[model samples]
Target: SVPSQKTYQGSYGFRLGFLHSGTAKSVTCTYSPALNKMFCQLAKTCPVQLWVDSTPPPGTRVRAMAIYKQSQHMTEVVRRCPHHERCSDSDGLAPPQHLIRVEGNLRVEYLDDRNTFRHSVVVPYEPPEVGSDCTTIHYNYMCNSSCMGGMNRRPILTIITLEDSSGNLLGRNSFEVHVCACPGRDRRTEEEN
Candidate 1:
């Protein structure tokens, strides 16, 4: 039987245009399996603490990267995940057909630093689609106060993390962000069991 997924209407803030301040900005990014990479443009400033999580079980891994508007290149950023207790859905049923609710949290700096001020972390990449038994992922970054005027960097909220073949950490990703808004024509196929 196909696993059932659910649907929900919520705000997954994404930059539509350049988000600039005195010295910072943010961009909306989406993963292109066709290109095997993520692409985006800055519409505003980035966040302070980027939260990331998933609807799947814990221990899943997520590979992530971020490029400042100035850099315009994929650079090593946050990877791995936070330590958490493992648990199941508790409810033995399908997730729904339009939405799937999984565990979630933020990925961020343990302590404050000067780099916290000069950096711009773009929104993490999210899996292209959600259907059948295939796994989907999402990613995001968080920061603190910045010199870009009174610009407030978003805090790490949450994202989807993907695992390796051996179920080891591989990369981080997202379930929504840009994709969720335009969920594709097959949005009806997301039913869970």
Candidate 2:
């Protein structure tokens, strides 16, 4: 059984009632100071039967079981940063709307293939000296038009990860961008032909 406490520093982070009934085989877990959360893994080797109500004519046997734990940590933060349009006095133009703010200590890396490095940028790579809460970073996507062919229109992979001070990974997520020919390309080709 898990002890009642305000914090779960070095314990399994689980109440003993559910897992204590069967023999404990093995468990592994790790704690992240950046996110202030604990990640745990558990497994049972032997089969155990558990019943909700045992007063019935024949108690049912529990064949399988699973465990789940909730977290109280801010694991990740993702927001889109749209392109800014220029505004001048001659033709006054306000900043485009629907732009979301991006924050958090994240490393956004853009890659061509599964293992090829292309470009990368860090959000607030260096924490501020004062009032530094390890939050806020830059995240934006832009592609170069060097390759003018349709065959090279494969999707570029974008990998983003939340990291700690010692270069340790806390969490990660990814997305893909398909760079193909635009609509006017075909018309230009037919005109040239």
Candidate 3:
């Protein structure tokens, strides 16, 4: 019998809207018959939903993304996963270490939102979802910051990377989130001063 009929190059998709064990209240998105693409929109403080394959690392897989706000020196994960998916003080201590945990080549790739010379293009990536995955996975985004001053709408593209059980590259799914505090009527606007 085969260990698993899976490949290194996995396939996934990005979704937008509310989630749960019930109905999926989707957000507003335009289907482009020309390009065969979807243009979705979200409020300043909306969460983006995501669905992916279940071929994530068997032991432990870590996800990395950019946040809206940061300190001077910059910060990363809390080193301790606050979600019960990671830490459960019932008895065990730290992860005793798994094959993937040791041999895995887990690393952060293409994470923006860092301190650059100017206000270059970089999308925020603050995900508060727990560590969970299924064949058809469901994860949502949590926006900590809104569109900056002057602009009524902001378009940003962020990415999500998944690693294999060996800590190698599994797949990368990108998302374009358009955040706007105003209604859909406003067409164009400049950066307010």
Candidate 4:
């Protein structure tokens, strides 16, 4: 019998498009005759398709080659401000406002395992000052106990996005927040059985 693996869910939030790398995102596929039965049985439920190069194309470039590559371009920005737990008195985490200037609307979403939207919100921008660049606008959200279960721990994915007045995206980031059921809360009843 094959056991199901727990799906990991998390949100990653960032300003601007973070995936600027020129490399194409890809997945690996391999087969060994000796372990064919074992691996195939293990992957009975995997959603990958098989494709072979029956019609080979002529090219000077190396086919299916893995190589090490390095880049010299890098940029860094530093900021000094209140930490996630300290910035907002709430129990949730949030980045500093200065990093995200709220000139437009802010959106936050919580996604489930299938990458489907479970819950979401769109908050209109309410800048503290119209022409002032000194104000930092922070976005914070919290997940309540309703998002947990007793069977096992689950991961929560959150997406935070900020846009400009013309609905132009300023920055978007996502990250995962794990939620585990409290054992002590359900202790006595199940154990008595």
lDDT of 3 by residue, 1-193 (tens): 1011122235433222232321122433332222222233331122234345333334434343322222321232211122322333322222311000111122312222245311111122223346633222222222211423312123333344455446565555444333333322121122111
Candidate 2 ranges with C-alpha deviation above 4 Å: 1-118, 125-138, 144-146, 149-151, 179-193
Q: Candidate 1 at 5: error in angstroms?
A: 33
Most TM-score-accurate candidate: 3
Q: Per-residue alpha-carbon lDDT of model 4 for 141-183, expressed as tens digits?
A: 2222132221012222334444444544444433332211322
TM-scores, all candidates, are 0.22, 0.26, 0.32, 0.24
Candidate 1 lDDT score at position 59: 36
TM-score-best of 1 and 2: 2
List per-prediction Cα lDDT, in the order shown: 0.25, 0.23, 0.29, 0.23
User: How much is 11 displaced in model 3, in angstroms?
Assistant: 8.5
Query: What is the TM-score (0 to 1) of candidate 4?
Result: 0.24
For model 4, the stretches where C-alpha displacement exceeds 4 angstroms are 1-118, 127-152, 179-193
- Worst lDDT 10-window in candidate 4: 60-69
Writing each residue's lDDT as its tens digit, candidate 1 over 147-169 gives 12111221121233334335443
Candidates in order: C-alpha RMSD to true structure: 17.8, 23.9, 14.1, 22.2
Arrange candidates by TM-score, highest first: which order?
3, 2, 4, 1
